[PDB]
Structures are given as structure tokens and as C-alpha cells.
Amino acid sequence: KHNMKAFLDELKAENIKKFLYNFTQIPHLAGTEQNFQLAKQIQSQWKEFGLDSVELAHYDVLLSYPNKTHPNYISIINEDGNEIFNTSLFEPPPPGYENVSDIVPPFSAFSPQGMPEGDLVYVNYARTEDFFKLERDMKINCSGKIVIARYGKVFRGNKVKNAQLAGAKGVILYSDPADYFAPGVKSYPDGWNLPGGGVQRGNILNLNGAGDPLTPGYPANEYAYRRGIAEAVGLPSIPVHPIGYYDAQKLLEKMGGSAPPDSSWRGSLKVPYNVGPGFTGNFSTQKVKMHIHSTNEVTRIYNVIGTLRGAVEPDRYVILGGHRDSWVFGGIDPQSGAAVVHEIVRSFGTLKKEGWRPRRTILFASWDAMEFGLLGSTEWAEENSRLLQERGVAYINADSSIEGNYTLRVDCTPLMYSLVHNLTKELKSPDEGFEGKSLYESWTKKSPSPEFSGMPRISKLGSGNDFEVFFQRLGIASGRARYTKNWETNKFSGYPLYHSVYETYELVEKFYDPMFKYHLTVAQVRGGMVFELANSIVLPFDCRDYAVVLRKYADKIYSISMKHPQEMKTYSVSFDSLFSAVKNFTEIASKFSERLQDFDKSNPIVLRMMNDQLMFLERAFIDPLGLPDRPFYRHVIYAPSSHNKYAGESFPGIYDALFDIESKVDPSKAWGEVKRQIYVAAFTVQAAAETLSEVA
């Protein structure tokens, strides 16, 4: 029998291991020859595995690279202009890779060039609230200062935007052991911790969903019009560079001025964590100098797109996509995900060779230039937007399969909650102590829902990954899943060796998943989701789950507003329309569910009518005018946080209208805009509800 069990059983941990090894022996930096060669390899293998067609889709997009003969570095400079300390020019390479060529040294992708000299101000995590505390409470002025910020808590691009608006003339990012060194664990290569010479690479753009900075709205094809750099989207205006904690200690140890305002500002280094500005009296004349010489350059990138044609509904697309480009070896990010995709394709191809085809078309994608701003996924979606918005059923992302070995993590649209619950009840837990128990059981035990007993936690989608164009721009139901750490065991996000040279095959094989059982579990979750979405006769979405969360989000946004009761009285700010729309959505979704379960099962038109209602329900939350000043974030329920691209925000339009409103100089204008966003949200919720009404 060709059923999901046949698909799932075919997946092998040993295959995922072999693919991971294969994908992580050399660097695959976007825009480089090595990453083009891997694209061609993937294309060849997906054909071999049995997909109907496999093509490369290429684009020419703005990328950013250090100058090989003019290295980036930071100095402490004395009053004579002598550089008395210099940060590293490279991370010490790990055992057995000390002769690997083409390792890109640590840099902040898209930094402008410059050599700013000045006094240091320490800004904690450079969050919105961190700058609020400096400027408003501590009365420290960052204008013309170089800021030093620790990585963590929020996307680094938001840190740089915040530093820029504070008037900084440069940003130094560093990894504090507080956030990247788990107590009791040894540094790579003897454990999974970040060594003091390790550095986190990463782009510092603020694209807000635009894709290639030079071609917002349109694919960066051969005849594309490209904005001039000065009009490009999302580029930082001040130089930025990342360093490790050995180097950070040297920059921070001399810092004077004001003491840290409290303990939440102190990391784990043996330094005061003084905010500055500048150094203590003996060193008061020493300054910090950055030297950044990186260049932005239009460069060709290559997505691999594989198609497995649907037998019944070939014009309905279920997409499994993740990126292939890495900063260096990509041992976790992204190759732990790409190896999983590779095995999923191989398994589907095995069934196909035995004569099976899924009901709907499955598209498989190996995206390029993700590390430089989700560029490959976004340019492809811009090219294919009309096909995706009329035919796109769902998008399942496939970046890193692991960031820990504790339990499952799922972030997805409410439309997929029931699908996820049901699938995980059918899968075996790989966890020790849960032998013979379901993944649902271990996941629920280790990651309980904060709201419901006997349910697991499922989070909203944020952003910072390749689902962004599909979900927040185009309104295609999206999901992601991976294995994660125990947040009770160290509160820091992600894994210590993130975006460092130390993220290698050996890191995974030795420390994260020796038996590749967590990889296999994640292949089963991602592949199982794709299988159901593509094969079920009724799409496996439950509209009633959206009704429940809409009420939760309406309560939450109302509660934020109600911290300002006088203003709500003065400006007649009512949430009645939003609650009414949510009530209506709940009622209509309930009746739709009845019809779906009750309709004449022999009638393919009623079924498809009803499958189209399910498919277009996520689409209904799209506002074609976008959110304020963010035209590519069009989903009215979910946007990436304006303060942290990684985090999702609910009712983002109303959230941003309320944020820091007490500080607005024209309260009438400000509360007027709150009311406008309530109207837009209520209307959108009612309009989405009405797509589930009887059609005529």
C-alpha cells in the first residue's frame, strides 16, 4: 500500500547522516562557485530520485563580501594614532579544517565602508527598551558614539536600526558568554559551546520583506531595473562588525562613565559593564576605530525547484522549501535541514517509481542567498506570485532540523494546529524515557501549552526565515518544525555555535544527534505534514482553530489599550467592532465545519469549492495596501515584530499604533490611528469570516 506509513517508513536516519556529511565538507557561501556546484549536484540527485522536473531558477541580487586584500578589524587607538590593540582577522579554524580554503572571515553583511573613530557606549542588547533606558532614564547620548552591543534577544538588523536612530556612528556586535556559553559545557571542539575566538556572522539589513534590495516587488531577472544603491531597500548607514568575547573583553574592560543601570545589563565577562561613554581616566584619551572595507556587489544566485506533479489536482501546490547557502560549513544551519529535505525527496521519489503520485503537486525548493536576506525564496515568489496566490495550498519550511536535543518545536498558522496534533500522535518519540510512546506524548510533557492542559505549545510564525514571503506577503498557510533545547536549561535563544566556523558535521555527529534519530523525527514531521497536505481529499486545515486564537489576540490587544483608560474615553476608542468580527468568524467557522463534515462526499465540485474556501482562508487575511510603511507585510493578523524580526506580533497594525503612545506629541493624531487600525483589523476579520459563508 502507498499511504503515509509507506512514505514515513522509507525515511532513514543513515541517509540523512550521509547527506549531512556530503553537504558540509566545504563552505557553500551564497554567490560562490562552490554553492553553484552544490545546486547542480542537488538538481542531478533530485532528478535521479524521480521528480518530474528539476530546474535551476537564477537571479542577480545584491550580496556583500569582505575585501580579501583589505581585512576588516577594530582597534583601540592611542592619542598618537597608534593602534595598540587589534581584533582577530579570522576565527581559529577547527581541527582538521585548518587548511580549508575560502572560509569567509567574520563580517556583518551589507555594512557600508568606513573607518569611524570615537568613544564607546555599551547598549546591552541594543533593543528598543535598551535605548529607551539610555536616552530617557540614564540621559546618555549615543550621537557620534560607537556603540557596542551584545548579540541575543532580537534580530541583529533591529539592533543596528536602533543604533542608527540613536545617532551612533558605528556598531560593534559581540557574543557574550552569558548568552552563548552554557555553564558546565566545554568549548568546541570538546563540547558545543562558543570559544572566545568564535564569531557570529550575519546580515544586518532591515528589508521588511522586500527581498533583493535593488528590485523590491519584482524578480531580479536578466532585464530587471535596479534602484541605485542610494535608493536600495534596507541598507545600514553606519559601519558594523562582529567580534568574539576574547576581543570584546579587551574593548569593554577599560569602559568608564555610568555604571550599568541594573543586573540585566551585565553579561558574564570579568568587566564592570559600564555604559560609558568612553574609557576610565587613565585611558580617557584612547578611542576605538573600526576599519570596514566590505563591498556590496550584484551576484548570481541559484534556487533548485523540483516538481512532483499531482495526479488529481496538479494545479494545487504544496511546497517544502529551505535554504542551501551557508555562512561557512553549515553543519546545523542549513544543512541539517537540507539533508532532511533531500531524504524526503528520495522517499517521495521511491513511491513515485512504484507508480504512486500525490493528489496535489508537491514543489521542493533549495533556496539560495537566504543568509543575505531571504533573497532566493523572495525573488522566486516575486516571479511566481500569481501562480502561488491562486494555487498555493501550503508552505512548509526546512531550515535547521535541530537547535537542541530536548523536544519538538513547531511554529505555524492556526490552520495547521489540528494536522500537527494528529500527525505527532502517530509518530514514535525518539526521546529517552519515552520509548514506545508517541511524539505527541513526549512533546506535550516537555513543552506544555501555556493555555490548555494535555496539549503541546505551538507558537506563532515570526520571521527571519524563508516562509516570510509565502506567509506574510502572499498569505499561504505556512509551518515549520525542528528539535530544540529546554528553555529551563539556559534561557538563551538558539545554539552557541550559530553562524560560526565551528558549526560542522562533527558538531552534529558528536554532540547533537549521534544516531540521527532527532533528524529522522523532524523528517517525519516535515514530510508527514507535506504528505497530508498534498494527499488528503479534504485539506487538513481547521478554521475553528483560527477563531480561538483570534479571540486570544483580540483580548491581548484590548488589554494593551486599556492601560490608557482616560485616552480611550477622550477619543472614544472602542474595540467593539473587532470583538464583533471575531464572534462572527467563530459562528461562521463553526457552520462551515458542520458543512465540511456533512457535505455530499460524492460531489467533487462541492469538495473543491470547500477545499478552495480552506485554501483561500489564510489568503483572506492579506490587505493589498500592506501595513504602515511596510508594503510587503500584508497579513493583518501576523507580522514580524517592528522591534525584532524573529518574533511574531499579533494584530501588528494596532500593536504598533499603541506602542509607546504615551510619548506621542499629538495624542489626537495617535489615537485616531489606533482607531483606524481597529477598523482595518475588524473589517479584515469579518471579510475572512465571509469567505467561509455559503458562496451563493
Ligand X SMILES: *[C@@H]1O[C@H](CO)[C@@H](O[C@@H]2O[C@H](CO)[C@@H](O)[C@H](O)[C@H]2NC(C)=O)[C@H](O)[C@H]1NC(C)=O
Ligand Y SMILES: *[C@@H]1O[C@H](CO)[C@@H](O[C@@H]2O[C@H](CO)[C@@H](O[C@@H]3O[C@H](CO[C@H]4O[C@H](CO)[C@@H](O)[C@H](O)[C@@H]4O)[C@@H](O)[C@H](O[C@H]4O[C@H](CO)[C@@H](O)[C@H](O)[C@@H]4O)[C@@H]3O)[C@H](O)[C@H]2NC(C)=O)[C@H](O)[C@H]1NC(C)=O
Ligand Z SMILES: *[C@@H]1O[C@H](CO)[C@@H](O[C@@H]2O[C@H](CO)[C@@H](O[C@@H]3O[C@H](CO)[C@@H](O)[C@H](O)[C@@H]3O)[C@H](O)[C@H]2NC(C)=O)[C@H](O)[C@H]1NC(C)=O
Ligand U SMILES: *[C@@H]1O[C@H](CO)[C@@H](O[C@@H]2O[C@H](CO)[C@@H](O[C@@H]3O[C@H](CO)[C@@H](O)[C@H](O[C@H]4O[C@H](CO)[C@@H](O)[C@H](O)[C@@H]4O)[C@@H]3O)[C@H](O)[C@H]2NC(C)=O)[C@H](O)[C@H]1NC(C)=O
How many residues lie near ligand Y (CB under 6 A)? Answer: 10
Cβ distance to ligand X smaller for residue 114 or 257: 114
Confirm or reject binding of residue 512 to ligand NAG (CB under 6 A). Answer: yes
Q: Cis (ω within 30 of 0) for the bond into 216?
A: no
Output 456 or 652, the one with its CB closest to ligand U.
456
Tell me which stretch binds ligand NAG (CB under 6 A): 110-118, 139-147, 538-546, 567-575: 139-147
Stretch that binds a second copy, among 157-165, 453-461, 624-632, 659-667 (CB under 8 A): 624-632
Is residue 430 a contact residue for ligand NAG (CB under 6 A)? no
- Alpha carbons 625 and 410: distance in angstroms, whole number: 30
Bridge partner list, 391: none
Site string for ligand Y, 213-252 (x = CB under 6 A): ---------x------------------------------
CA distance 170 to 243: 14
- CB of 523: closest distance to ligand LHK in angstroms? 16
Q: How far is the CB of 275 from ligand NAG (least distance, A)?
A: 15
Which entry of ligand U, ligand LHK, ligand X, none binds 422, CB below 5 to 8 A by partner kind? ligand U
> For ligand LHK, what does the binding mask look like between residues 401 and 440, x meaning CB under 6 A?
--x-------------------------------------
How much of the chain is in helix, strand and coil states, percent to nearest 5?
40, 20, 40
Establish if 86 lies at the interface with ligand X (CB under 6 A). Answer: yes
Q: Give the residue, chosen from 84, 115, 185, 387, that forms a contact with a second copy under the rule CB under 8 A.
A: 387
Supply the minimum distance, in Å, between the C-beta of residue 109 and Ca ion. Answer: 17
Question: Is 589 one of the binding residues for ligand U (CB under 6 A)?
Answer: no
From 9-17, 52-60, 143-151, 629-637, span contacting ligand Y (CB under 6 A): 52-60
Q: Which of 83, 190, 555, 594 binds ligand X (CB under 6 A)?
A: 83
Partner residues linked to 570 by β-bridges: none
Regarding 203 and contact with ligand LHK (CB under 6 A), the answer is yes
Q: How far is the CB of 352 from ligand U (least distance, A)?
A: 24
Q: How many residues bind ligand X (CB under 6 A)?
A: 9
Min CB(326)–ligand NAG separation in Å? 19
Query: How many residues are given for the chain?
Result: 696
- Distance of closest approach, residue 41 Cβ to ligand Z, in angstroms: 4
Residue 141 touches which member of a second copy, Ca ion, ligand NAG, none, C-beta under 5-8 Å by kind = ligand NAG
Judged by CB, which is closer to a second copy: 21, or 558?
Answer: 558
Can you tell me the distance from the alpha carbon of 516 to that of 339, in angstroms, rounded to the nearest whole number? 11
How many angstroms separate the CA atoms of 14 and 30, rounded? 28
Query: Which residues precede gaps in the chain, with C-N > 2.5 A?
Result: none
Q: What are phi and psi for residue 459, nearest 5 degrees?
A: -100, 160
Contact status: 404 vs ligand NAG (CB under 6 A): yes
- Contact 431/443 with Cβ under 8 angstroms? no
Binding residues for Cl ion, rule: CB under 5 A, are 397, 399, 480
Lookup: cell for 374: 531571504
Task: State the SS3 of 60-121.
Answer: EEEEEECCCCCCCEEEEECCCCCEEEECCCCCCCCCCCCCCCCCCCCCEECCCCECCEECEE
278 phi-psi bin (left φ>0, alpha ψ -120 to 50, beta other): left
Query: Which residues, in sequence order, are CB contacts of 627 under 8 Å at separation 6+?
Result: 633, 634, 636, 639, 652, 653, 656
Q: Does 485 bind ligand NAG (CB under 6 A)?
A: yes
Minimum distance between the CB of residue 18 and ligand Z, rounded to whole angstroms? Answer: 8
Query: Among ligand U, Cl ion, a second copy, none, what does residue 397 contact (CB within 5–8 Å per kind)?
Result: Cl ion
Omega before residue 334 within 30° of 0, cis: yes
Does 212 participate in binding a second copy (rule CB under 8 A)? no
In the list 35, 384, 400, 413, the residue contacting ligand LHK (rule: CB under 6 A) is: 400
By CB under 6 A, tell whether 528 contacts ligand U: no
Could you say whether residue 137 binds ligand U (CB under 6 A)?
A: no
Q: Give me the helices (H) in 370-473, please.
A: 375-383, 385-391, 417-426, 439-446, 468
Residue 482 CA, chain-centre distance (Å), reads 13
Q: Which residue has the cell 516587488?
A: 217
For Cl ion, give the closer residue by CB, 24 or 108.
24
| Beta-bridge partner residues of 55 | 305
Q: Is 89 in the site for ligand X (CB under 6 A)?
A: no
* Best CA proximity match to 497, nearest among 506, 592, 321: 506
Residue 234 makes contact with ligand LHK by CB under 6 A? no
* HSE-CB for 39 with a 13 A CA cutoff: 28
One residue of 45, 361, 465, 521 binding ligand LHK per CB under 6 A: 465
Nearest-approach distance from CB 401 to ligand LHK, in angstroms: 9
| Three-state secondary structure call for residue 346 | helix
Query: Residues binding a second copy: what is the number (CB under 8 A)?
Result: 53
For 635, the 3-state DSSP assignment is: strand
The set of long-range contacts for 217-220, using a CB threshold of 8 Å and a minimum separation of 24, is 217/382, 218/382, 219/59, 219/379, 219/380, 219/382, 219/383, 220/59, 220/60, 220/61, 220/379
Grid cell at residue 377? 525564496
> Site for ligand X (CB under 6 A): which residue of 5, 40, 70, 556?
70
Q: Rule CB under 6 A: is residue 511 a binding residue for ligand NAG?
A: yes
Grid cell of 178 as nine digits:
552569558
Total Cβ atoms within 10 A of residue 282: 9
Residue list 550-609, contact with ligand LHK (CB under 6 A): none
Answer positive or negative: Cα dihedral of 627, 322, 542, 410.
negative
Residue 291: beta bridge partners? 73
| For ligand U, the closer CB: 543 or 689 | 543
Q: Out of 580, 590, 603, 693, name the contact with ligand Y by CB under 6 A.
A: 580
* Shortest CB 167 distance to ligand NAG, Å: 6
* Torsion sign across C-alpha atoms 525, 530, 532, 533: positive
Interface pick for Zn ion out of 267, 334, 373, 528 (rule CB under 5 A):
334
Alpha carbons 75 and 85: distance in angstroms, whole number:
5
| Residue 63 vs 255, nearer CB to Zn ion | 63
**Interface with a second copy (CB under 8 A):** 52, 217-219, 221, 223-225, 307, 309-310, 312-315, 317, 361, 383-387, 390-391, 576-577, 604-605, 608-609, 612-613, 616, 619-620, 623-625, 631, 672, 675-676, 678-680, 682-683, 687-688, 690-691, 695-696
**Interface with ligand NAG (CB under 6 A):** 141, 143-144, 192, 404-405, 485, 511-512
**Interface with ligand Y (CB under 6 A):** 55-56, 58, 222, 577, 580-581, 584, 682, 686
**Interface with ligand X (CB under 6 A):** 67, 69-70, 75, 83-86, 295
